[PDB]
Write a protein that binds this ligand. Structure first.
Ligand SMILES: *C[C@@H](*)[C@H]1/C(=C/c2[nH]c(/C=C3N=C(/C=C4\NC(=O)C(CC)=C4C)C(C)=C\3CCC(=O)O)c(CCC(=O)O)c2C)NC(=O)[C@@H]1C
Ligand SMILES: *C[C@@H](*)[C@H]1/C(=C/c2[nH]c(/C=C3N=C(/C=C4\NC(=O)C(CC)=C4C)C(C)=C\3CCC(=O)O)c(CCC(=O)O)c2C)NC(=O)[C@@H]1C
Ligand SMILES: *C[C@@H](*)[C@H]1/C(=C/c2[nH]c(/C=C3N=C(/C=C4\NC(=O)C(CC)=C4C)C(C)=C\3CCC(=O)O)c(CCC(=O)O)c2C)NC(=O)[C@@H]1C
Ligand SMILES: *[C@H](C)[C@H]1/C(=C/c2[nH]c(/C=C3N=C(/C=C4\NC(=O)C(CC)=C4C)C(C)=C\3CCC(=O)O)c(CCC(=O)O)c2C)NC(=O)[C@@H]1C
Ligand SMILES: *[C@H](C)[C@H]1/C(=C/c2[nH]c(/C=C3N=C(/C=C4\NC(=O)C(CC)=C4C)C(C)=C\3CCC(=O)O)c(CCC(=O)O)c2C)NC(=O)[C@@H]1C
Ligand SMILES: *[C@H](C)[C@H]1/C(=C/c2[nH]c(/C=C3N=C(/C=C4\NC(=O)C(CC)=C4C)C(C)=C\3CCC(=O)O)c(CCC(=O)O)c2C)NC(=O)[C@@H]1C
Ligand SMILES: *[C@H](C)[C@H]1/C(=C/c2[nH]c(/C=C3N=C(/C=C4\NC(=O)C(CC)=C4C)C(C)=C\3CCC(=O)O)c(CCC(=O)O)c2C)NC(=O)[C@@H]1C
Ligand SMILES: *[C@H](C)[C@H]1/C(=C/c2[nH]c(/C=C3N=C(/C=C4\NC(=O)C(CC)=C4C)C(C)=C\3CCC(=O)O)c(CCC(=O)O)c2C)NC(=O)[C@@H]1C
Lengths: 68, 160, 161, 241, 160, 161, 161, 161, 160, 161
């Protein structure tokens, strides 16, 4: 139910690529709480920097309604 | 709660509430008074329920209080009783809410890691919760006893 | 998201407190108005398109918004505005059923303001349309849930403004 | 002139035109968000995303149910990966491709829709079917979308689309059989499980190993070694005979 | 039905049924006899309800029986009445089932495409369904009248 | 898939032949009718829904198919049948544009017969609906492309039957 | 998936018939036994792990199956067998609650036989484990729902064999 | 996959037996032939491209396969055929290092035949290319590992044919 | 084994083995004779090591041989000793193969569900493995003791 | 089996139609080519053994097929292979006389492929022999029926491959 708003930059370290390729390297997008964990690992394992993270939807205290 | 579950499903589907969900909401609001009476009864009888559950658990599993047991020691037993009180409180929360959402968000997700990191016997905790169910069912009428027993059975099933 | 019951439950969870007389009173105050929320929500779901049409007729159309240079001009922009209105209606129904503005805050209001500023959407016109929808909903539902539904429309308008 | 003529004249042409991989491998389009800017290109990307998932048949029935997702995608609040993931979380996908098939076939349907191939081997079936049954659809879809293969193949902004794999073995025919099936055309699971392949050639019958075993016998039985000769002359080569 | 919905959600989450789902199943099985009585009442009054809803529909929208309308002519009107009978039978099915699954699978999914192909006014058919709701609630006691009105409201909202 | 030009090119490539008088005559014959194909395709695209409407009215509806026990009973099955009808129309338009039934064999008829056998769809009813669409399209397009459009509808009908 | 109520509803929908006295009798017969199914399902969910353990101890383990050369040998294969048993128990619970074997045929038995032949899993041992679980469930639930639960375990066994 | 060591270990684990004289003899006989396999694999890896070129020249090209209409006609299919020969050579090297054709069965031969009937590839031509590579590899590796190298190419050819 | 692991890693990238991998293979084939000698040394004393490890484990954790213990009774203790023998055999297999590949497939993956369904104490099994390691290293020279202790520690870490 | 006449007759029987102008045109076109087919069949029947001898010499023998271990090593297999070539030639003659490959589908290609994988016969070598016979037959029959003769050999080769 909580959504992370994350901005990241993933450079290309092989084959350079040719067509316009702009949303594939620097992006900002909402990510769910449950999948943000395994995606942050993927971003930093693909040699990508995580510029910004925002809590956005959720509440810091939580304790109920988070798991919905 | 039932309201939270129905709203979440309808919002995920992107539609207004269905007649079945409306009927279940009406049934929940009708049964709310009986639910709060049951919760008040259990809250009043929280101490006796905890004590009788503790004695039943210890008679069933004396090894847990044995030297090679996780619950060996006076404060080790006190902490187990405190966790028992916690789960009884969660049972009252679920009974008042009409579903198991707060219980899930508080005390079943990550509880396998809970007791694996603490080396605590999950089957022993389940037996203690069952003793709690017996004690609480001894203090309610048949319909309310079954209603609380559903939530106690849910806790036992989650502890599995 | 949370309803009234879940808000009370987590406010007691943070203190580790059994439910007491005050929490029971709050839950009873929620429960005594349960069926009114249900009938009003059923009425709103039945008359969703008519409410949107009447609110648009009173607040948006027949103005410079629907003419060239307006933010309502062109079929695409009109579709966006009416889809937004339908979103507001459905989420107002959800909030009034749950007895809490948590769902409206979580799933609508986050980002909507600066999104509208970026796109050029008129916040004042959106608030006027929301208020017209609120008045139509209050007319349809009746005395029993008029104010009860209007509080969440006012929440939406105050969040937008 | 005659060294570029066919030999064994192709008496029936276009019997040799169709040989090799199907033309569908190269006669289809790939959609990318980074080059799908403007409204006209965005609608094509959106309608293509509903066809990679949902397999083109119950995709035509979709009218306006996924309208909040499309608005966020158009406003650049969520990437195409997030759009594809949230499409797999919907009740329509669960109703169509999970609620009518066994738990092992849901993994196959999930693979062909979110990665473009069939199941690689038995060690992947065990990993992904043993997670779908443990935590349901919303974990299996998250595992596929967040996997390393998806990140390599499509990255942030790209519709998944069918791939015709070369490796591993049997992956190409398994994938193509899934590809050329209409929805509800056939519901056999194609790859139920990978049979054990057993062994038909004993390792001791190989030339090098068998050639070393005979030498091992002779060296141990016949000849002596570097202890004193008085000890080596009082040895019985047999042990119990 | 409610059983189908609860079982489907439990299967999708890979877990046994929740206490709230069990409670709603118990409530549905408790309300079954009243649901059957309501269904018997409407199925006995099927012809009068259909004819009356025809009268209010044609009074409210004479243009549909105008020559520029879809239902111009005696057999076009008969087909409209037969669609009305279809929707009434679906309403009885939904009332006995306790939720909207069979009605959804039978007469709402693709109904927009069908009526767009036939060039029939969906708002006009919705008005006919509303007249049906009025006629049916005229022959029913208040609790069960509201119960049937919920399903009629669901049909009206679906045709929208 | 192949069009007329790529079909000729591949048919000569497999034999390793340069384009000769016969192949050039074939290409000339295709090129001489390019404009009529484009006009007929535009007309069919503009009149797509109406053609399906008259085809369904003259072949399928008002019978036992739409009644209970019929294959196209219920809204879901009616929508599925009309979507299949639209599929046939669109792929027939593609075939008439390309001047070759290769796309029809590749992406339509492949497994359609046994899929319909599995689902219980009436193949005779499908052939009747296809022929109804053929008559409607022949009426709309005119003498110029009537027979050329009709040959691919006949191809689809013969493939299903 | 189908239950008794939905099965009767579709069986009448295929004829386009209003619900009559016979269908009312059938759904009344289902409604009369609603609570017993709920109580038995709650008991099964309570004793899920113990039922699996007792069925395994009575039908599978302490044999050649759990020794070297046995199909259930090694921790991975043992975990797979117990997960299969858990699948059987949960889907038997669902089928018993729904009052129909449609979910059993429709989410479990489809292709399970051929998958077991491909993997080499013993169908006879699986059926023995299913019957042991059935006996344990019949002991736990009591006379009220014993036969009702046992019919679906017998359905699973007859579908597998 | 599995090598000689894992083959012995699995054959003893299925019986649940500790390693005995026969198992140690098999392991010693494998360990003695360690350096020869490594040297042969290094030679094959260094001369991979020349082996493929000579095998293709001796068995495939200069014929109807490479002339128009042939299966190896066009660059698209020529590159695919040489890639397939490279795959066969690489997996033969893996099998020679492991001392077991289990890798050939698991990762090369399964599905390969029916894939080749699906694509239209000549199985006899593929077998001829494999045997040409076998002759070249046997020439390169020397008398030490000639038979060991040739056995796996014969295994691949017999599996394909 | 080492060869299987290197071949799988090369096949994942679809390339011939690098000279570094051939160097690892050469080192493994050099150490193979010592590895098999260590394995036969452990195999000759399998019963004594199992017995002493069982006595040590029962001394450290008497609760398992207590009434509430999983291994209470002669036949329960026999099963525990048989499991310890199984793990000793797996350790010898791993030492011979030079890699933990056979051990993981045979007796590690799914061991958690194994001992959870059997209600056996996983830390108790780990302590039994540690006592087995001590008995094994008492019968071996220092380098061979360390070599066996690597695989014993791997088993202890995996059963965790 | 069926010839051109019976094929037209059955294709009109399935519609229950009397013979029309198109059917009569097809029958006339078949009847005009009567003497040519008879002459070609007589020439092939007279030169049957020589065609097989030249095709075998050009495509099969003097190679690993006839050298030991080959599939046509030993007299028992050589006689079988030449008998198979004679069978192909005879059925090609039948199909050429009838003007329809239905006899080839019914009595030659039915299960021939899977029989060949069962026996281990090289299908590519069989196709090479068939095309050698095709070249010899095209040389013998003359320019009148060369294409007609060649099409059925190509049909057989494409069916096998
Ligand atoms: C000597 C070459 C012969 C030949 C071959 C040929 N093959 C293809 C296409 C494919 N080959 C494979 C092979 C494999 N799949 C596997 O998993 C492995 C092991 C890793 C193998 C060896 C597959 C799957 C394909 C299809 C997909 C692809 O193209 O990658 C082709 C091309 C066919 C086409 O493009 O349609 C050819 C030509 N052809 C000959 O004439 C030779 C005898
Ligand atoms: C005039 C309508 C007739 C009819 C049809 C009918 N079809 C279905 C279901 C499907 N039809 C298709 C068709 C296609 N998929 C393709 O890719 C193509 C070519 C590009 C075609 C033609 C498929 C795959 C399905 C199954 C999936 C789906 O439903 O979309 C149905 C529904 C059957 C059911 O309820 O299960 C119907 C009714 N029925 C009639 O009565 C007409 C003769
Ligand atoms: C030190 C002993 C510990 C202990 C163990 C214990 N185990 C069992 C029963 C079984 N253990 C196994 C084990 C395996 N099967 C395999 O394939 C492998 C991999 C090689 C293992 C490790 C099995 C299958 C059983 C079931 C019986 C059977 O083998 O047929 C028991 C008995 C439990 C019961 O309920 O009877 C015990 C007690 N107990 C302890 O206290 C120690 C920690
Ligand atoms: C309508 C009364 C007013 C109006 C609106 C308008 N909105 C947009 C664009 C967007 N609106 C949304 C809204 C939502 N997305 C959500 O998920 C939710 C809650 C579930 C809401 C409310 C978003 C995200 C967008 C941007 C993406 C999109 O366009 O879909 C437009 C279009 C602007 C443009 O052309 O770029 C318009 C016009 N316009 C009026 O005149 C009214 C005052
Ligand atoms: C009546 C209140 C409105 C109206 C209706 C109208 N309907 C038709 C024709 C058809 N309607 C159906 C409907 C259904 N088939 C199903 O399976 C279901 C779900 C239970 C429904 C609702 C069908 C199939 C037809 C086609 C004919 C047939 O049944 O065989 C018409 C005739 C249109 C024509 O062009 O002939 C009309 C007029 N018209 C109104 O004005 C009312 C608002
Ligand atoms: C246990 C009593 C018996 C047994 C079983 C066994 N099963 C497997 C592997 C699988 N089992 C399944 C099962 C299902 N998939 C479904 O969708 C359903 C119904 C919803 C079922 C029951 C599947 C798909 C597999 C394959 C994938 C996997 O392993 O998870 C094994 C493992 C075989 C192996 O090692 O390859 C075993 C051992 N074994 C016994 O001894 C009992 C008779
Ligand atoms: C000529 C300007 C240059 C040159 C050429 C050269 N080619 C070969 C051999 C072959 N060339 C091909 C080519 C193709 N096959 C295809 O499918 C296509 C696409 C239409 C092409 C272009 C093939 C298949 C061969 C192999 C033999 C065969 O065709 O059967 C050679 C001979 C090489 C050798 O004998 O080893 C040569 C020399 N060489 C030059 O120096 C020129 C610049
Ligand atoms: C020699 C005394 C007489 C003679 C022989 C002759 N043979 C051939 C050609 C072939 N002979 C064989 C024979 C066999 N294949 C088998 O499997 C066996 C059984 C072990 C035998 C005996 C074959 C297969 C051939 C074909 C070529 C090949 O082997 O690949 C010829 C050549 C004929 C030609 O037309 O080329 C001849 C001349 N001829 C005499 O006059 C002698 C009396």
């Amino acid at each position: 139910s909580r959504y992370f708003k994350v901005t990241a930059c993933i450079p290309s370290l092989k084959r350079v690529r040719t067509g316009r390729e702009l949303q594939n390297t620097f992006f900002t997008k909402l990510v769910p709480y449950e999948n943000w964990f395994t995606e942050q690992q993927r971003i930093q394992k693909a040699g990508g920097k995580v510029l910004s993270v925002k809590l956005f939807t959720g509440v810091q205290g939580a304790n109920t309604g988070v798991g919905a | 709660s039932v309201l939270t579950k129905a709203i979440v499903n309808a919002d995920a589907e992107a539609r207004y509430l269905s007649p079945g969900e409306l009927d279940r909401i009406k049934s929940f609001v009708a049964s709310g008074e009986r639910r709060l009476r049951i919760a008040q009864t259990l809250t009043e009888a929280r101490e006796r329920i905890v004590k009788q559950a503790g004695d039943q658990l210890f008679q069933i599993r004396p090894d847990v209080v044995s030297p090679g047991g996780n619950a060996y020691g006076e404060k080790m037993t006190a902490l187990c009783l405190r966790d028992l009180d916690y789960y009884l409180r969660l049972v009252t929360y679920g009974i008042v809410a009409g579903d198991v959402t707060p219980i899930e968000e508080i005390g079943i997700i990550g509880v396998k890691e809970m007791y694996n990191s603490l080396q605590t016997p999950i089957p022993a905790v389940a037996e203690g919760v069952r003793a709690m169910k017996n004690v609480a069912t001894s203090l309610l009428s048949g319909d309310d006893a079954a209603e609380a027993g559903f939530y106690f059975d849910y806790l036992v099933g989650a502890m599995q | 998201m949370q309803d009234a019951i879940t808000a009370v439950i987590n406010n007691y969870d943070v203190q580790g407190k059994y439910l007491d007389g005050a929490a029971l009173d709050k839950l009873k105050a929620y429960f005594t108005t349960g069926a009114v929320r249900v009938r009003a929500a059923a009425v709103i779901s039945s008359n969703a398109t008519t409410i949107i049409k009447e609110a648009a007729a009173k607040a948006l159309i027949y103005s410079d918004l629907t003419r060239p240079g307006g933010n309502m001009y062109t079929t695409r922009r009109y579709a966006a505005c009416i889809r937004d209105m339908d979103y507001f209606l459905r989420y107002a129904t959800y909030a009034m059923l749950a007895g809490d503005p948590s769902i409206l805050d979580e799933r609508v209001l986050n980002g909507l303001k600066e999104t509208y500023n970026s796109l050029g959407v008129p916040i004042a016109a959106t608030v006027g349309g929301i208020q017209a929808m609120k008045e139509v909903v209050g007319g349809l539902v009746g005395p029993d849930a008029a104010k009860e539904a209007s509080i969440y429309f006012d929440y939406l308008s105050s969040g937008l403004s | 002139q005659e060294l570029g003529t066919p030999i064994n004249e192709r008496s029936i042409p276009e019997m040799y035109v169709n040989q090799g991989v199907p033309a569908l491998k190269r006669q289809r389009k790939v959609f990318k968000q980074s080059q799908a800017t403007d409204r006209e290109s965005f609608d094509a990307l959106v309608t293509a995303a509903y066809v990679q998932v949902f397999d083109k048949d119950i995709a035509s029935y979709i009218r306006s149910e996924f309208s909040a997702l499309e608005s966020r995608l158009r406003n650049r609040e969520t990437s195409v990966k997030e759009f594809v993931r949230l499409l797999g979380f919907s009740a329509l996908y669960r109703k169509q491709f999970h609620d009518r098939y066994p738990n092992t076939k849901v993994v196959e349907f999930a693979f062909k829709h979110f990665l473009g191939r069939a199941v690689k081997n038995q060690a992947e079936l065990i990993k992904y079917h043993g997670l779908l049954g443990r935590k349901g659809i919303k974990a299996l879809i998250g595992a596929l979308v967040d996997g390393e293969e998806y990140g390599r193949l499509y990255g942030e902004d790209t519709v998944p689309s069918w791939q015709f794999p070369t490796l591993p073995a049997a992956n190409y025919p398994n994938s193509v059989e899934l590809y050329n099936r209409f929805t509800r055309q056939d519901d056999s699971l194609v790859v139920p499980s990978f049979k054990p392949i057993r062994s038909k050639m004993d390792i001791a019958s190989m030339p090098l190993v068998q050639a070393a075993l005979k030498e091992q016998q002779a060296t141990k039985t016949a000849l002596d070694m570097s202890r004193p000769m008085f000890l080596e002359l009082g040895r019985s080569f047999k042990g119990a005979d």
